[model samples]
Target chain A: DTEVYESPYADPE
Target chain B: GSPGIHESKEWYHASLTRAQAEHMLMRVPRDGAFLVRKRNEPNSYAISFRAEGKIKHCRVQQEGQTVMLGNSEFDSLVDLISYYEKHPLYRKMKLRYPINEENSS
Candidate 1:
């Protein structure tokens, strides 16, 4: 619950 | 109203906040069970889902004509949902179940 938001999986640019 | 995505009732939850969305996913208690909700910001959305026994939140950004979530860009939210359903959205989390409006209480 502490981690409200996490980054989505992204492709390398 | 948008055309394709709006017509698809199983993909969009237009009136859920981040907390409500997470609650719905948690009730299902299944990893990769996900839902899409409109964010407070204009032209933005959030994808809330259960992953690895926890609920996670991520943003879906819209820039002009394209919708960007994670590393992928698509012409619509419908396409984004389709792409992530078959692929990992975050780390090892692939969208397995789409918790539609009618299902979530």
Candidate 2:
């Protein structure tokens, strides 16, 4: 599945 | 508390983002949580928090530059809340929202 979730602290890695 | 505590009515509280609003719940006084929308220009909102020490009562203000207190006691509305948590000045801190003292719920 291709998807993305916005992290609360503006950091996703 | 003095009636002058209430200056601007129709506070723009809810307009603050969900995170900010949620943050306010933890620190704002339960019975006395009200704010003032700027009359001349509603560009920003101003609300005051108070701390009742056995010796004195203080109108919380933004924290900056160590200027005369009763103002300049905090950063954003959120910072004001955090200030009391660690600061030694306040003892009877109460809030509308249950204090989420466990890791910022």
Candidate 3:
């Protein structure tokens, strides 16, 4: 997958 | 945030620059694009919009904004943008978009 850093707070989980 | 919103649930910033990104909110064509709604008062209203990644607001009320902030009046969104588009400060608060200055009549 072409992914780098993830969103700091994309979700509330 | 690229071509996408790249939003956040915990925190966010409303910053825009010609470097990281560019905008052309300078000419906010019509009032329809703005999210306007009646205020909790008589003949009062407010406008909200996002610039790249930040949220901005404009309001006109019987208590203040209209009579003071803008040193003017509030009749409609069209009137608001028209007045703000050239005011000392509000004019700079206009919105932006892709190809900021690329198009024709």
Error of 3 at B9 (Å): 30
Local accuracy of candidate 3 as per-residue lDDT tens digits, B31-50: 21223343333444444343
Off by over 4 Å in 1: A1-13, B1-10, B13-18, B88-105
Ranking by TM-score: 1, 3, 2
Query: Which pairs clash (backbone N, Cα, C closer than 3 Å) in model 3?
Result: B14-B54, B25-B95, B25-B96
Interface RMSD of each: 5.5, 18.2, 18.3
What's the TM for chain B in candidate 3? 0.32
Candidate 2 Cα errors over 4 Å, as ranges:
A1-13, B1-13, B16-40, B53-75, B94-105
lDDT of 3 by residue, A1-13 (tens): 1111111111101
Residue-wise C-alpha lDDT for candidate 2, range B1-105, written one tens digit per residue: 111112322223324443233235324444223232111222223333433322122222223332122334333433333333333234344222233334544
lDDT of 1 by residue, B1-105 (tens): 232344333256456566566567656534566677776556566665566655546657767677777667766555655555545445544554553444453
Query: What C-alpha lDDT does candidate 1 achieve relative to the native structure?
Result: 0.55
Q: Of models 1 and 2, which has the larger TM-score?
A: 1
lDDT of 1 at A4: 42
A9 in model 3: Cα distance from truth in Å?
A: 30
